[PDB]
Amino acid sequence: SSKGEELFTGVVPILVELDGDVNGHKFSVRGEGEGDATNGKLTLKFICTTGKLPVPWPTLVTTLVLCFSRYPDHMKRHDFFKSAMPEGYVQERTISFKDDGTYKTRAEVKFEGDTLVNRIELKGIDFKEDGNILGHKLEYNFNSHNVYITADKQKNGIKAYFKIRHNVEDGSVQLADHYQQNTPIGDGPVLLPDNHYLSTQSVLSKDPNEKRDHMVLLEDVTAAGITHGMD
Ligand SMILES: [Cl-]
Predict the structure, then answer these.
(1) How many contiguous H segments (helices) and E segments (strands) does the chain have?
(2) By C-alpha distance, which of 76, 59, 58 is closest to 67?
(3) What residues does the ion ligand 1 have nearby, CB within 5 Å?
(4) Can you name the residues that pair with 44 across neighbouring β-strands?
(5) Do residues 203 and 217 lie in contact, with contact meaning Cβ atoms separated by under 8 Å?
(6) Domains of the chain by range and CATH?
(7) I need a labelling partner for 76 at 20 to 30 A (CA). Which of 85, 107, 131, 195 fits?
(8) Do 107 and 185 meet the contact criterion of CB atoms below 8 Å apart?
(9) Distances in Å between the alpha carbon of 63 and those of 91, 209, 211?
(10) Contacts of 220 by beta carbon, 8 Å cutoff, 6+ apart
């Protein structure tokens, strides 16, 4: 157990702030809600504060707080994300969309007061203007995934590897290959994990009285051991 884990005991407010620029189409997203790490549960509504989101909402789910993952008792000694709190961690990804562009993201995840804040910069390049992403051809849904986590001893953080398959409106799938690196912001000790999985489940919806372009997300995330965590 870490000291940082103690910050997660009950329900914690979350603020997510994302500035994006994909093929020169700029946007901002703000997320508001709460996290319950005991149960591995997140409740968030995200609004595009610049008006129309120029990419599909499902392509931003992974970018838009793994510190709310439920680590079973016997895996708590492997929970990097909470151990890095309150000072927090940097999270970087390259997300490669098969036969289309790439997103590069850099986020800082830390507490500000009693709120957990995820502040992200996203830059996408090499997208097709007519493709599945800039052409909004993806279905509004998000399937369950398995994130593979490994220690990065030299950086005293973690790497993660996973694939997201987004359903396309014509019945095809759009792959998005995720490469991820996390490093702590503070100088204090953290917990480095053995290899494991995070098992994820996500429900996307709309708030019927919300006029702005938005996404309501319910997410469940639980850590799982190495033998069966792939499915
Ligand atoms: Cl969408």
Answers:
(1) 1, 11
(2) 76
(3) 56-57
(4) 33, 217
(5) yes
(6) 1-231 (2.40.155.10)
(7) 107
(8) no
(9) 9, 25, 23
(10) 39, 40, 41, 42, 200, 201, 202
Which two tokens mark 77?
């000694």
CA gap 48, 228 in Å, rounded: 37
141 CA to centre of ligand 1 in angstroms: 9
Tell me how far CA of residue 109 lies from CA of 14, 47, 64, 223, in angstroms.
10, 19, 11, 19
CA–centroid distance, residue 28 to ligand 1 (Å): 15
Secondary structure class of 143 (helix, strand, coil): coil
d(CA 73, CA 209): 40
Q: How far does residue 4's CA lie from ligand 1's centre (Å)? A: 35
Question: Using an 8 Å Cβ cutoff, are 125 and 131 in contact?
Answer: no
**What are the b/e assignments for 1-21, b being 16+ CB within 10 Å?**
ebebbebbeeebebbbbbebe
What resolution in angstroms, rounded to 1 decimal?
1.8
Q: Please tell me the distance from the alpha carbon of residue 225 to that of residue 10, in angstroms, as a whole number.
A: 25
Residues 166 and 140: their CA atoms lie apart, in Å, by 9
DSSP-based three-state secondary structure for 195 = coil
